[PDB]
Structures are given as structure tokens and as C-alpha cells.
Curated annotation (Swiss-Prot), chain B:
The gene is S. This is Spike protein S1. Attaches the virion to the cell membrane by interacting with host receptor, initiating the infection. The major receptor is host ACE2. When S2/S2' has been cleaved, binding to the receptor triggers direct fusion at the cell membrane. When S2/S2' has not been cleaved, binding to the receptor results in internalization of the virus by endocytosis using host TFRC and GRM2 and leading to fusion of the virion membrane with the host endosomal membrane. Alternatively, may use NRP1/NRP2 and integrin as entry receptors. Binds to host ACE2. RBD also interacts with the N-linked glycan on 'Asn-90' of ACE2. Cleavage of S generates a polybasic C-terminal sequence on S1 that binds to host Neuropilin-1 (NRP1) and Neuropilin-2 (NRP2) receptors. Interacts with host integrin alpha-5/beta-1 (ITGA5:ITGB1) and with ACE2 in complex with integrin alpha-5/beta-1 (ITGA5:ITGB1). May interact via cytoplasmic c-terminus with M protein. May interact (via N-terminus) with host bilirubin and biliverdin, thereby preventing antibody binding to the SARS-CoV-2 spike NTD via an allosteric mechanism. Changing A29D: In strain: Alpha/B.1.1.7. The lineage of its organism: Viruses, Riboviria, Orthornavirae, Pisuviricota, Pisoniviricetes. The chain holds residues 542 to 590 of 1273 of the full protein.
Length: 44, 49
């Protein structure tokens, strides 16, 4: 599972981490079979 | 017999909206009371006799 809050139109400076609790829903569920200990998300 | 669960009751229509990764609904007493039909994907409700 990968819980993502891809929130656009943020009327605020980036600055620091956002405040307030933020509920997230899962957006992926696929049968790998093993468990993951590393990754690399390509940045374009 | 919904995909494996055996019970008894009456099935009606409910307005609860399941998340896509969920299939069963519970209550206070931790017993199932809402199921999703495997063939057609509407949400039902379970109440006893």
C-alpha cells in the first residue's frame, strides 16, 4: 500500500511540514509476494 | 452464502459507500452486517429475522 496525499492548489508557502491531521486512503494494492526494503522513485 | 460466509437474515439496500479495497462491514459486536455481492458490485445490508 502507498498512502498519498497529492494535494494541489495549496495557498500557502511550502516552508515546513503541514499541520493538522490528514486522513489518507490507499491507492495501490497488488500481489508482490515478497516485502520491500528499498526503492527509487524516478524524478523527472 | 456470500463468497464463503454462512448466515440467515433479510437483505436490503444500504447507502454506505465502501472503499475499493474493502468487502465486509462490521458493527459494535464485531459481527458482519454489510456485504458486497461478488458478481454485481452493489452494497447490501444484513438484519436478523
Amino acid at each position: 500500500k502507498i498512502y498519498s496525499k497529492h494535494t494541489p492548489i495549496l495557498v500557502r508557502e511550502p516552508e515546513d511540514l503541514p499541520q493538522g491531521f490528514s486522513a489518507l486512503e490507499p491507492l495501490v494494492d497488488l500481489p508482490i509476494g515478497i516485502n520491500i526494503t528499498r526503492f527509487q522513485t524516478l524524478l523527472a | 452464502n456470500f463468497n464463503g460466509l454462512k448466515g440467515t437474515g433479510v437483505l436490503t439496500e444500504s447507502n454506505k459507500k465502501f472503499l475499493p479495497f474493502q468487502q465486509f462491514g462490521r458493527d459494535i459486536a464485531d459481527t458482519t452486517d454489510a456485504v458486497r455481492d461478488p458478481q454485481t458490485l452493489e452494497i447490501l445490508d444484513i438484519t436478523p429475522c
